[PDB]
C-alpha cells in the first residue's frame, strides 16, 4: 500500500482539488503558487520558501550554509522535487515506524481553538490554506502539513508554523499546521568515526546522510508541534561533553535532543522529563475542559459531534455517558511517549539500516548535490544501498568515495568553524 496514490507531474493540469493554485495565510501579500495534495491533510509546494517569514523574502545571501538563488526555479527542477519528496514519503511509509509516525501526523488535526466565546468551537484560519477553485474563487481547506522548498539558505531545513496572537499553539496541546523547509536535491556528509565526526577540524565527509532520515527528523518535529507538545526552544542543554562546543558556548535545545533520541535524549534529566510530561498532561486536560464547554460549532462544514470525535481520536480522550471528555493518564503517557521516544532520528536509522550521525552533537563536513529520482540511483526500499549490487554491503551506496557518481561535493565545512 502506498502513501501517495498519484505520481504527480509538475506540468499536470490544475484541477482545484489536489493540483491547485493556493495561498498560505502569511502576513502580507503573495501571488498564488501551484501545489500538490499528496495525501489527506498533506500538501507539497515545489517553490523556494519566500512566504512564511516576512524578513526572508529573497534568496540572496553561517558556516554550514549554502546559497544558490536559482535552485528550484525551473519546471524540471520542480517536477524532480515533487518526485523526490514523494519517494521519501514512500520510503518512510514502507517502514513500520514511518507508517506509525505518518498516521499520527494525519490524525493530528490542529485544535479548533479559535473561538473567544467558550460555548462555541471554531477553526483557527492560519491552520488552513486558500485553494483556487475551477471558478476562480477561493475556498478554505484545513491541512496539517506542507512541504516546501528552502528559503535563501538551501540547507537550513526546519519545521515552522504560523503563530497566534495569544496562544502558543505548538506548546499548549492545540497544534498548528506545520511547514517543513526541505530539499531532496542535496545531502550532508558525515564521518564514520565518532571522534572524527565530533571534531570540527577533521574529515571531509566520506559518508552521505540518507535524505529519508533528514525528512523523518523534520516530520518528528512536526509531530511534536501538531500535538502541541514541543519543548520551548529556550530550554537548552549547555553542552559539556564536547570541548569544541564548550569553547564556543554552543547550547542545544531539549527539543533537538529529544528528536534525535538515543543517548542524546538522556541529557534531559528525569526531573525535567517529568516536568514536561506533567505540563503537557495539564494542557490536554485544558483541551478536554474546552471541548466540554463547547455547545455549538462555528461554520457549516463539519458537525460538532464529528469534530469532538476528531479530537477524542487525536488526544486519545475518554468519553463517558454524558458525552463528557476526560484525559486518562495512562493513555496520555502512552501517546506522549510514542510521539517523543518512539519517533526519533535514531530509531529511523535502525529501521532504514543506514549509516548516520551518531549524535546531534557533531560538526557537519560537506554538502553534496544528489539525484534520488532515478531508480538506478536510489529506491524506496534500499535508499542508496541498492540490493544485489556493490552498493548493498557496508553502506557502500552512502560511501561517497565508492558510489562517487551519486554525489558532487559543493562545499566543505571542516575548518570553517572558528577553531
Amino acid at each position: 500500500m502506498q502513501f501517495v496514490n498519484k505520481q504527480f507531474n509538475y506540468k499536470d493540469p490544475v484541477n482545484g482539488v489536489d493540483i491547485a493554485y493556493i495561498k498560505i495565510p502569511n502576513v502580507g501579500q503573495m501571488q498564488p503558487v501551484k501545489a500538490f495534495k499528496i495525501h489527506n491533510k498533506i500538501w507539497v509546494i515545489p517553490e523556494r520558501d519566500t512566504f512564511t517569514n516576512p524578513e526572508e523574502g529573497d534568496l540572496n545571501p553561517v558556516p554550514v550554509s549554502y546559497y544558490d538563488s536559482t535552485y528550484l526555479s525551473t519546471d524540471n527542477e520542480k517536477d524532480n522535487y515533487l518526485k523526490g519528496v514523494t519517494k521519501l514519503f514512500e520510503r518512510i511509509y514502507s517502514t513500520d515506524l514511518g507508517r506509525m509516525l505518518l498516521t499520527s501526523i494525519v490524525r493530528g488535526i490542529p485544535f479548533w481553538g479559535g473561538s473567544t466565546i467558550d460555548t462555541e468551537l471554531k477553526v483557527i484560519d492560519t491552520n488552513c490554506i486558500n485553494v483556487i477553485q475551477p471558478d476562480g474563487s477561493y475556498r478554505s481547506e484545513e491541512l496539517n502539513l506542507v512541504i516546501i522548498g528552502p528559503s535563501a539558505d538551501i540547507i537550513q531545513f526546519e519545521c515552522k508554523s504560523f503563530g497566534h496572537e495569544v496562544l502558543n499553539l505548538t506548546r499548549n496541546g492545540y497544534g498548528s499546521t506545520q511547514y517543513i523547509r526541505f530539499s531532496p536535491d542535496f545531502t550532508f556528509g558525515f564521518e564514520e568515526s565518532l571522534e572524527v565526526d565530533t571534531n570540527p577540524l577533521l574529515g571531509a565527509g566520506k559518508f552521505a546522510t540518507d535524505p529519508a532520515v533528514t525528512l523523518a527528523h523534520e516530520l518528528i518535529h512536526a509531530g511534536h508541534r501538531l500535538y502541541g507538545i514541543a519543548i520551548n526552544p529556550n530550554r537548552v542543554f549547555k553542552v559539556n561533553t564536547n570541548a569544541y562546543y564548550e569553547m564556543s558556548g554552543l547550547e542545544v535545545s531539549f527539543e533537538e535532543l529529544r528528536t534525535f533520541g538515543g543517548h542524546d535524549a538522556k541529557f534531559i534529566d528525569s526531573l525535567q522529563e517529568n516536568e514536561f510530561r506533567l505540563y503537557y498532561y495539564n494542557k490536554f486536560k485544558d483541551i478536554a475542559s474546552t471541548l466540554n464547554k463547547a455547545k455549538s460549532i462555528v461554520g457549516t462544514t463539519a458537525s460538532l459531534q464529528y469534530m469532538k470525535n476528531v479530537f477524542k481520536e487525536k488526544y486519545l480522550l475518554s468519553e463517558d455517558t454524558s458525552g463528557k471528555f476526560s484525559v486518562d493518564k495512562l493513555k496520555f503517557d502512552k501517546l506522549y511517549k510514542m510521539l517523543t521516544e518512539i519517533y526519533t532520528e535514531d530509531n529511523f536509522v535502525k529501521f532504514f539500516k543506514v549509516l548516520n550521525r551518531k549524535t546531534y552533537l557533531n560538526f557537519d563536513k560537506a554538502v553534496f548535490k544528489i539525484n534520488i529520482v532515478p531508480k538506478v540511483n536510489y529506491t524506496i526500499y534500499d535508499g542508496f544501498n541498492l540490493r544485489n549490487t556493490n552498493l548493498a554491503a557496508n553502506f557502500n551506496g552512502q560511501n561517497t568515495e565508492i558510489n562517487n557518481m551519486n554525489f558532487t561535493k559543493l562545499k566543505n565545512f571542516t575548518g570553517l568553524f572558528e577553531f
Binding site: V64, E158, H217, H221, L250, E251
Partner: peptide, 7 residues
Amino acid sequence: CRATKML
C-alpha cells in the same frame, strides 16, 4: 537540522 545553526 544541525546544532551549529545556533552559532
